[PDB]
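In the laboratory, one determines a bound structure by crystallizing the protein with its ligand and collecting diffraction data. In a computational setting the workflow is compressed into a single prediction: the sequence and the ligand go in, and a structural description comes out. We illustrate the idea with HYK.
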Amino acid sequence: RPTFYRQELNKTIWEVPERYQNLSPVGSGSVCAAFDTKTGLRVAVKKLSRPFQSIIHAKRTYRELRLLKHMKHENVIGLLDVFTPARSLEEFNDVYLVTHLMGADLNNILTDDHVQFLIYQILRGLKYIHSADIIHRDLKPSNLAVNEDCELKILDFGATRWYRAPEIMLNWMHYNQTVDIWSVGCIMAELLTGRTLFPGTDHIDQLKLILRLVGTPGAELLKKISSESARNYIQSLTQMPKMNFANVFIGANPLAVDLLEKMLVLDSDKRITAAQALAHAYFAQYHDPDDEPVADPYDQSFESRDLLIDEWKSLTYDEVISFVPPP
Ligand SMILES: Cc1ccc(-n2nc(C(C)(C)C)cc2NC(=O)N[C@H]2CC[C@H](Oc3ccc4nnc(C(C)C)n4c3)c3ccccc32)cc1
Ligand SMILES: Fc1ccc(-c2c[nH]nc2-c2ccnc(F)c2)cc1
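The predicted complex, in structure-token form:
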């Protein structure tokens, strides 16, 4: 069992193994950059705040640890280490997560080639995540970590609405993985043009900005809408045609525009998947179907369970104990 040391950074206490040196805040739980003396790498360390404050916090704790232990892909955050200063289940009350420090997000960070490489990486990571039956649900520039080599990893820190699928603004319960492809569409647009595609002020403003580009719903999509209030609102708007994307995004590589149209189709059932998007001609320089792996099966049966705080806590403790670092 390693030797821990204690310090206070910005009202927050950090108790981490001596392995980890030069802790300095990055953002806000709360996150520090460190030096990993065992490997010579710079790392990010997340301390979970009050992980067992409520059943919902305890289950969030378990969920993030179970997810981060499963993700083993070049374009998705993975776990280098996980530790607690606690020496017993009874005193277990703090969780720290360690990953590779990339150093910037996509807000911080372009030719056409740079857009190709950045969006290729997002889709290669999303292929992997979607293959585990996980939806990200909050893809946006601030959840995309980029190093000096413009290598990219998808993460989740926990305006969001700007990158959000229109079916989510509408509060449809049965949305599918292509909510994430919508978000990627909004990101690629902003990288090509330098402007937020849909800078809505609220969920109503956001829906109106979206339907101005992609049109109000056609008949095939209206038939799938259960809610009377939702249909009453949408069909009462001034009806709008799909705009000509070649016009809106004039100046962009026409192959980029063609992919944008396949991502930003209003009906989620007609949107391109991540696997299909990787095979699109826009990524000819990067695409290799032998180097676009899928995930091992991911058990999320726990999501339907209703357990006590102490049960979520013991489960979380067994996951910390069983952790095996990557080579
Ligand atoms: C309740 C919950 C919350 C989040 C999740 N989640 N779901 C996922 C995927 C779907 C699989 C994508 C991922 C996560 N959790 C997650 O990503 N953790 C990050 C949060 C950022 C934090 O900071 C980092 C990490 C690396 C890094 N490199 N550069 C910089 C900044 C300059 C932007 N980084 C900043 C972190 C530091 C340690 C260890 C982890 C982390 C799941 C459940
Ligand atoms: F104004 C609109 C109308 C429909 C959508 C939408 C897009 N894809 N799927 C839907 C959908 C499917 C079933 N039920 C719903 F409520 C929504 C988005 C905005």
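The radius of gyration is 22 Å. Keep in mind that any predicted model is a hypothesis to be tested, not a measurement.
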